[PDB]
Design an enzyme around this catalytic site. Structure first.
Site, PDB file in Angstrom:
ATOM      1  N   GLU A 153       0.825  -1.205   0.000  1.00 21.21           N
ATOM      2  CA  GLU A 153       0.000   0.000   0.000  1.00 21.21           C
ATOM      3  C   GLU A 153       0.861   1.257   0.000  1.00 21.21           C
ATOM      4  O   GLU A 153       0.558   2.233  -0.704  1.00 21.21           O
ATOM      5  CB  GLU A 153      -0.939  -0.011   1.205  1.00 21.21           C
ATOM      6  CG  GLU A 153      -2.240  -0.768   0.967  1.00 21.21           C
ATOM      7  CD  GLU A 153      -3.321   0.096   0.338  1.00 21.21           C
ATOM      8  OE1 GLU A 153      -3.203   1.337   0.393  1.00 21.21           O
ATOM      9  OE2 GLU A 153      -4.292  -0.468  -0.210  1.00 21.21           O
ATOM     10  N   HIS A 178     -15.721 -12.565 -12.328  1.00 26.16           N
ATOM     11  CA  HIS A 178     -15.441 -11.534 -13.319  1.00 26.16           C
ATOM     12  C   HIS A 178     -16.299 -11.678 -14.565  1.00 26.16           C
ATOM     13  O   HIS A 178     -16.497 -10.692 -15.282  1.00 26.16           O
ATOM     14  CB  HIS A 178     -13.964 -11.564 -13.698  1.00 26.16           C
ATOM     15  CG  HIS A 178     -13.065 -11.017 -12.637  1.00 26.16           C
ATOM     16  ND1 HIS A 178     -12.566 -11.792 -11.613  1.00 26.16           N
ATOM     17  CD2 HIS A 178     -12.582  -9.769 -12.435  1.00 26.16           C
ATOM     18  CE1 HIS A 178     -11.809 -11.046 -10.829  1.00 26.16           C
ATOM     19  NE2 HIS A 178     -11.803  -9.814 -11.305  1.00 26.16           N
TER      20      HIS A 178
END
Ligand SMILES: *[C@@H]1O[C@H](CO)[C@@H](O[C@@H]2O[C@H](CO)[C@@H](O)[C@H](O)[C@H]2NC(C)=O)[C@H](O)[C@H]1NC(C)=O
Ligand SMILES: *[C@@H]1O[C@H](CO)[C@@H](O[C@@H]2O[C@H](CO)[C@@H](O)[C@H](O)[C@H]2NC(C)=O)[C@H](O)[C@H]1NC(C)=O
Ligand SMILES: *[C@@H]1O[C@H](CO)[C@@H](O[C@@H]2O[C@H](CO)[C@@H](O)[C@H](O)[C@H]2NC(C)=O)[C@H](O)[C@H]1NC(C)=O
Ligand SMILES: *[C@@H]1O[C@H](CO)[C@@H](O[C@@H]2O[C@H](CO)[C@@H](O)[C@H](O)[C@H]2NC(C)=O)[C@H](O)[C@H]1NC(C)=O
Ligand SMILES: *[C@@H]1O[C@H](CO)[C@@H](O)[C@H](O)[C@H]1NC(C)=O
Ligand SMILES: *[C@@H]1O[C@H](CO)[C@@H](O)[C@H](O)[C@H]1NC(C)=O
Ligand SMILES: *[C@@H]1O[C@H](CO)[C@@H](O)[C@H](O)[C@H]1NC(C)=O
Ligand SMILES: *[C@@H]1O[C@H](CO)[C@@H](O)[C@H](O)[C@H]1NC(C)=O
Ligand SMILES: *[C@@H]1O[C@H](CO)[C@@H](O)[C@H](O)[C@H]1NC(C)=O
Ligand SMILES: *[C@@H]1O[C@H](CO)[C@@H](O)[C@H](O)[C@H]1NC(C)=O
Ligand SMILES: *[C@@H]1O[C@H](CO)[C@@H](O)[C@H](O)[C@H]1NC(C)=O
Ligand SMILES: *[C@@H]1O[C@H](CO)[C@@H](O)[C@H](O)[C@H]1NC(C)=O
Lengths: 692, 196, 692, 195
Positions: free
Chosen positions: A356, A486
């Protein structure tokens, strides 16, 4: 006297007022994400409605301006991105129909359930279902659960998805593009000039060549995995055949990592475990962040502004407002950077925090370019930048050198092999699956094959490339590929392959500057500045330049390659070459239900002639019913048993119209292999012309 | 006359704002300097404070700025943070001294400011990008101008003409803290501040 | 020097010590019912375990004493009650099997679920299902839901119930009783006071005579209800046929009250609605209890102990200790009494409070009798005492005379008719159902009906007595009777009939003393003492005497009768005699699926004999598939539609093995066929010897 | 002597327990009687004022700890346990009933821990248990083991074949108490004289 400065002034105009409004919208979103309250929903609604209204008014006022008169590429990119109409050329009824069907598909996927006949009052949702899939160790139960989920979800997704693809193709055709496949392909290169001949269609052969080159390593790994897998489940795996689909340890097969427990070379040597030091020291949540900041600053990149440390979400809220722990790097603009995540003391948390922070520091470097260009060059760089640092930080040598992991550890020539195998079971396993799924979705979209051949094509493909064979025959009414996530959310699914390649591409290219000596897996990003200078040179460009230019800036090559990837695995390849040096490969014919079925030869209709007819369905109906009756009477003949065989107990397979059948029968409630050849053969022989 | 800065203890310190004060031939006592405030921390550019007790030379440079304790870690120039190029310049010159202070309550003449405020982005807007201006020695945040309007909200921003400004507001809790800068000019002259 | 004074000493040693444990155990149960905590649960466990310990040690030490040597009936009753083996004569394995199967049945009943093919992702439990049945007014939907629940629950209850009945019959036979029915009948039995003769067998003919006498009134009411029902659902009710089961408003038909809305004669005249007075004055929970106490004392009964008013549960606790609001009248003994209920301001709450007050008054009125006799004489009195008072207090004249309901109301000769109809729709509706169910269970247990005919008899009975016809044919594999509540919990179900007779039996006789003038429905128990004296004489007797003597005390008759019941309804009978004076009755033949079916009887086997065999429940499968195929091709040949007809789409009907039966076809996903005779006839005629 | 009951303000009042107080030729003032206490008085159709004159046989003064709300049930109109299973509500020559809530001025009076009134004292038997009832001039003949005391709710104990069970009522706030004045007619030596 107009030239194109009118564009310049209009650009400055939206630049004035875009940033602030974006700021309020984003801060409202953050406010909701931190505190969960009903009024926050109204706040986000009243913000995003006017935000989209501003989008629509600026788009409609920006459409009339011509495009062919633009000469400077920098402004041309912004104008082309802005001057887009898309679905606006669609009439309202079909637009709302598309929205409704998408919402219906999402809802139906969100609320799955599969229940066993034995205890029909107990059963699970996707979460506990996945937990059972991950933990269970029974062949029968796992096969059962996979089949049940696939059947239940597929049976309710055929017409909806068919209409969805029809409408999407119509929209793409009406948007001046040849097909939706082109529309997705209308991205990810969309450039090239004066040094770069490449266009949209070249990507096909690029990926084809890359996969062809990468094949041998995956073939060898597949050989080893097949050799090892037969330990758990004997009398189920052909020496030269493929593998059952449900035995890949995961719901679909996107990741093989869960098989590591079974393919461990040996349990004699314990792995690295230094949780004790941090657990007894009890590092605070801020300690890890400060250490990571020191690490990153050690390479020369600027450190985060002090204001970041004040407005943040480092720790658990410890408040009634419930929040989710999914790490995010919120980039609000105007030097407002915030990290949202709950912090604990684990290595995985350490690497996630590093990832991150890499995300946010990459985002920071280009803040001064513009608004519209606030983005990565493609869909792969943004995650690649974090992934390269995440890979680098995990090396044991650095961890030893930074203070942790004292020198009381002598690495051997097998531990690194275990680490490489662990990395490979995830980095390479998903490539064939991603390639196959993407290819199938494309060819379905443009319409090369008719709708009636979907499922008959899919399993052929899975037999060909990946190396997985279906457990039980499936008819046409199924819609297996829609059971994924997906597939049901219309998300582009190409980024993963190119991201995985570019990761190691950058790794090797950057390590070249560091002048390492041994295998690339021992490279380090320790004290240095030229590497940091190169990295800054890469990052600062942003979207203002073609990505191929960036690769030339570091990679110094105009295209991607797998040579660094295979080089990184060279020790693994040599180690594996000594284990499967006799046989490797597969045949697309064998299957678990191959030595059990019966040929059931078919007589020609023309040979009969009179009282003859084409199937037009409805006739294997009669065949199945008749054979079921024959089996029922067969058990009563001598077995004296009361099994109530049903109609759907005959498995049709491998049909060629009026040319052949194949079938085998299974028990009502324990369908694994039951009712072998001889019994059904005797039963069918016993009966008479009452069938045919 | 005496080199005294008595009227300094008047009220709110400068928030981007700045001032300059100079004296003439005089005499200054070390006892009052010591009594100014207790020892929190002082850092001098390789110049002993004791050696400064003697010698009448060109001038001193006294300024007090609103600040906080922890940010003094980032005060030292070792990064390109917004504090140096987008806020008060960390001007480097003839060896100087930096002092951190936490004013006690008994100096009631001082008035506690409402909230702290340091700029984040002041720039001259352009077509292609932002065209950041960067602070330089002897400049004191050249942006100024519309920054006099003030700040009222988080990340409050406003632009005038083609200059755009935005800053950060830090609420103050508990007792305030102060930062003192003493930049020195050598050479004996009429402006020189003399000891005693 | 023994005689029977040794029994007296034993009973002293019992009664003097059997107390002071029940108090604490019941206090723990009270604490749990009021406070929901685990500590209270363990308190109940540690109390009841030793309570049962004392019970079983007392039983095992009391068995050896002889019985035939006892002459005094008072002590003989207690000795007989205490001395009994029961299930103790069974093996541990069978006992644990019985307990396990009972728990399994309870669990499976408590967790039902049914839901539609249209929206399978949402399904209901019984709690909301009953609400849907109560509110929904769709023929299709109601029939669907009833069929679904019946199928789902029945399919999983056949073998367990068979085992349960087998084991119960075996254990009852092993306990010196001919059948379990006799064991259940052993509670109504009583000896004679030299002039009374009451054996178990006489009960059947007594109830049979009572039902035969009561029949005509129910026949007339049934005529009126049938005449009225056809308004809602035309073209579904035969003028002389029965009624569909699912149209009786309630889930099973155990009550008819929900049809009041549809059978209201007219909406012009508003009913009684005096909620306003106490809604605006807001009577507190204490004042209603005080007024009820004043009413009860007005007849002369002693008022409640002052110590009670503090320790009680009159109001809502208003805390986190959640409680349930079922009204209960707990008798803890030792002059410790408690009423548990959450109190609101409504008429139903008023009558329920009066009912509980009557319960506690009756319980308290007797305390001098020994512990073992502290119960009602039979299973009906204990609720009859409350029900009679509840009936009495509801009269409008008294409510007017006690302060509420001012004199601004002039009753007419139709409002009382509406009140009588409302009462009758519940008081009499359940008698035929209760009688039928009890008879069916008795005959199944005793064993005249073999297992194979369990379900063929039930629907015949429903056609015969009650007057309800099934909506769709049901085969043998179903287990309809076990889908109820009391059946699944092995609770004797006969008490309700005797109680329903006894309320009015008492009412008429008691009102005889009051010297009323008009119809019995106008009787009152207002200020008076002699009636209270008679009631005290009735109640104080307790269990020390045969119940026939109790009836003789006030009823002055040795047996029950329906004459008071029909007398109470005489105005209703005369009113109804003017509405259905032409036709009334039913035929056990007609049914909804009667005019839309075709016989199939070809004597294929007996006609020739060769190549054919007796029906073995299997060739039915061949016929099903063949006719399904015929219908498939009939639709596909000209209609041009795709209806994948299943196997479970042809309804087999009554059978005799005599090559004769009926059926009709049904749509795959509507559960309500149209499919006229002509279409299926043409389809079957089209086909050839492929079938027969 | 003076018909004074000064030692009454001594401590805890009797809980079933009872006592007898009588005096002889004397004088008694109404001023002290009024100053004794301020709440409700009910005489058996006898005016309290008329009682201020005339010397005659004797008075009947007794004080019993009690509660105000139960005073409604004090009036004999039901067969509640207070009369047949607790202190007899003896009926004789017209008497007077008075309710009181004693203040804290005189600390000599000691507040009892908790109140206690009997619920069931009976003679256990074979079939029943001989629910004997109290009678006038008897004062709860059960007694005996009842002197042991009560500790718990519905506390019970039996001795020989006599069984006793009572109730314990916690006290909140200021205690409450009642007087009974049953006077005896006729002038004699033990007569209580006014002044
Ligand atoms: C379904 O049938 C299979 C095949 O017989 C059963 O699997 C056997 O289970 C036993 C359990 O003791 C094992 O010893 C055998 O090795 C298994 N056989 C095979 C071929 O795997 C299975 O148990 C049956 N399932 C159910 C639910 O009855
Ligand atoms: C955005 O900021 C970067 C910061 O690196 C600017 O990069 C400068 O580029 C110019 C030439 O265009 C060089 O002379 C400077 O030395 C660079 N600054 C550095 C490396 O700090 C970039 O130009 C800025 N973009 C805009 C549009 O102003
Ligand atoms: C329990 O006690 C009650 C009184 O509380 C008894 O009632 C008495 O019964 C006798 C029986 O001969 C009658 O003569 C009396 O008139 C009854 N008294 C009252 C007040 O009604 C009752 O009999 C006792 N029960 C037992 C079983 O001994
Ligand atoms: C099952 O078929 C019946 C045939 O009647 C359908 O009931 C009719 O539905 C139509 C609309 O399709 C209504 O107008 C009629 O009033 C209904 N009843 C009749 C004609 O008696 C029923 O809708 C079908 N079930 C489903 C789920 O579609
Ligand atoms: C896009 O759609 C708009 C709106 O209908 C239309 O004016 C325009 O011509 C279309 N084409 C392009 C290239 O934007
Ligand atoms: C790329 O080269 C090919 C082959 O000569 C040519 O057909 C194509 O037009 C070229 N495209 C570009 C964008 O230069
Ligand atoms: C793998 O094995 C480890 C122990 O080596 C165990 O803790 C873990 O649960 C197993 N499963 C997975 C999925 O890792
Ligand atoms: C950089 O050099 C310092 C010198 O003290 C050393 O401690 C530190 O570990 C080095 N950093 C890396 C990343 O090698
Ligand atoms: C009950 O069981 C006991 C103990 O086995 C036995 O003596 C007695 O005969 C049985 N019968 C009855 C009626 O109690
Ligand atoms: C009832 O009467 C029958 C028939 O006379 C007789 O056999 C039987 O003993 C009687 N029963 C009783 C309990 O009196
Ligand atoms: C009956 O009708 C009333 C109105 O008269 C309505 O409120 C109620 O819901 C209906 N249903 C029942 C079951 O009473
Ligand atoms: C009985 O009569 C009395 C005296 O008139 C009256 O107060 C009381 O309410 C009456 N009781 C009833 C129940 O009507």
């Amino acid at each position: 006297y107009t030239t194109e400065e009118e564009a310049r002034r209009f650009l400055v105009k939206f630049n004035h007022e875009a940033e602030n409004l974006s700021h309020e919208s984003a801060l409202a979103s953050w406010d909701y994400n931190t505190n969960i309250t009903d009024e926050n929903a109204k706040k986000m609604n009243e913000a995003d409605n006017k935000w989209s209204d501003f989008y629509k008014e600026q788009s409609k006022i920006a459409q009339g301006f011509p495009l062919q008169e633009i000469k400077d590429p920098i402004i041309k990119l912004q104008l082309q991105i802005l001057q887009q109409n898309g679905s606006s050329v669609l009439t309202a009824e079909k637009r709302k129909r598309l929205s409704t069907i998408l919402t219906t598909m999402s809802t139906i996927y969100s609320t799955g359930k599969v229940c066993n006949p034995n205890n029909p009052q107990q059963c699970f949702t996707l979460s506990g279902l996945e937990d059972i899939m991950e933990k269970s160790k029974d062949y029968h139960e796992r096969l059962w659960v996979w089949e049940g989920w696939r059947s239940e979800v597929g049976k309710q997704l055929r017409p909806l998805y068919e209409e969805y693809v029809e409408l999407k193709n119509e929209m793409a055709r009406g948007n001046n593009y040849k097909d939706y496949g082109d529309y997705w392909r209308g991205d990810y290169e969309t450039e090239g000039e004066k040094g770069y001949n490449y266009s949209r269609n070249y990507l096909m052969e690029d990926v084809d060549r890359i996969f062809l080159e990468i094949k041998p390593l995956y073939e060898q790994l597949h050989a080893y995995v097949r050799a090892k897998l037969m330990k758990a489940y004997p009398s189920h795996i052909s020496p030269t055949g493929c593998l059952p689909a449900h035995l890949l340890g995961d719901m679909w097969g996107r990741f093989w990592t869960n098989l590591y427990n079974l393919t461990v070379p040996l349990e004699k040597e314990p792995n690295i475990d230094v949780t004790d030091t941090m657990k007894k020291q009890s590092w605070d949540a801020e300690k890890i962040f400060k250490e990571a900041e020191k690490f990153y600053s050690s390479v020369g990149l600027p450190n985060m502004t002090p204001g970041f440390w004040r407005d943040s979400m480092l720790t658990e809220p410890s408040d009634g407002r419930q929040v989710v722990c999914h790490p995010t790097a919120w980039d609000l603009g105007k030097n407002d950077f915030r990290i949202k995540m709950c912090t604990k003391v684990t290595m995985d948390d350490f690497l996630t925090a590093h990832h991150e922070m890499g995300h946010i520091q990459y985002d920071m470097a280009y803040a001064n370019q513009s608004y519209l260009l606030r983005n990565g060059a493609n869909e792969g760089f943004h995650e690649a930048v974090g992934e390269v640092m995440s890979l680098s930080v995990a090396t044991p040598k650095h961890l030893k050198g930074m203070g942790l992991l004292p020198s009381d550890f002598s690495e051997n020539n097998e531990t690194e092999i275990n680490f490489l195998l662990k990395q490979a079971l995830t980095i390479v396993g998903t490539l064939p699956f991603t390639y196959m799924l993407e290819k199938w979705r494309w060819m379905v979209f443009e319409g090369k094959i008719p709708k009636e051949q979907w499922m008959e094509k899919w399993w052929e493909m899975k037999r060909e490339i990946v190396g997985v064979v279906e457990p039980l025959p499936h008819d046409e009414t199924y819609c297996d590929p829609a059971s994924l996530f997906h597939v049901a959310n219309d998300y582009s699914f190409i980024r993963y392959f190119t991201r995985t390649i570019l990761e190691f591409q950058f790794q090797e290219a950057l390590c070249r500057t560091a002048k390492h000596q041994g295998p690339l897996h021992k490279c380090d990003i320790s004290n240095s500045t030229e590497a940091g200078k190169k990295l800054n040179d890469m990052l600062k460009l942003g979207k203002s330049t073609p990505w191929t230019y960036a690769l030339e800036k570091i990679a110094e090559t105009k295209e991607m390659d797998a040579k660094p990837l295979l080089n990184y695995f060279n020790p693994l390849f040599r180690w594996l070459k000594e284990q499967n040096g006799n046989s490797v490969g597969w045949s697309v014919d064998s299957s678990p239900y191959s030595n059990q079925s019966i040929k059931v030869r078919i007589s020609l209709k023309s040979a009969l002639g009179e009282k003859a007819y084409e199937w037009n369905e409805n006739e294997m109906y009669l065949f199945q019913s008749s054979v079921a009756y024959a089996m029922r009477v067969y058990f009563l003949k001598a077995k004296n048993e009361s099994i109530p065989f049903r109609a759907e107990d005959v498995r049709v397979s491998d049909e060629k119209k009026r040319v052949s059948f194949k079938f085998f029968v299974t028990s009502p409630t324990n369908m694994s292999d039951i009712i072998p050849r001889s019994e059904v053969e005797d039963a069918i022989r016993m009966s008479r012309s009452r069938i045919n | 006359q005496e080199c005294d800065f008595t009227p300094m203890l008047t009220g709110t310190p400068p928030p981007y704002n700045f001032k300059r004060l100079v004296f003439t031939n005089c005499n200054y006592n070390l006892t009052k300097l010591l009594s100014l405030f207790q020892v929190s921390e002082f850092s001098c550019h390789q110049v002993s404070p004791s050696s400064l007790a003697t010698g009448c030379y060109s001038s001193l440079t006294v300024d007090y700025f609103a600040y906080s304790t922890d940010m003094s870690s980032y005060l030292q120039p070792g990064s390109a943070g917004a504090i140096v190029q987008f806020n008060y310049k960390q001007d480097f010159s003839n060896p100087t001294c930096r002092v951190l202070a936490t004013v006690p309550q008994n100096l009631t003449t001082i008035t506690k400011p409402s909230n702290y405020a340091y700029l984040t982005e002041c720039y001259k807007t352009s077509a292609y990008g932002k065209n950041y201006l960067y602070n330089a020695p002897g400049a004191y945040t050249p942006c100024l101008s519309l920054a006099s309007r003030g700040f009222s909200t988080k990340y409050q921003s406003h632009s005038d003409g083609e200059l755009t400004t935005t800053g950060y507001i830090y609420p103050v809790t508990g007792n305030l803290q102060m930062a003192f800068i003493i930049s020195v000019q050598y050479g004996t002259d009429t402006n020189s501040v003399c000891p005693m």
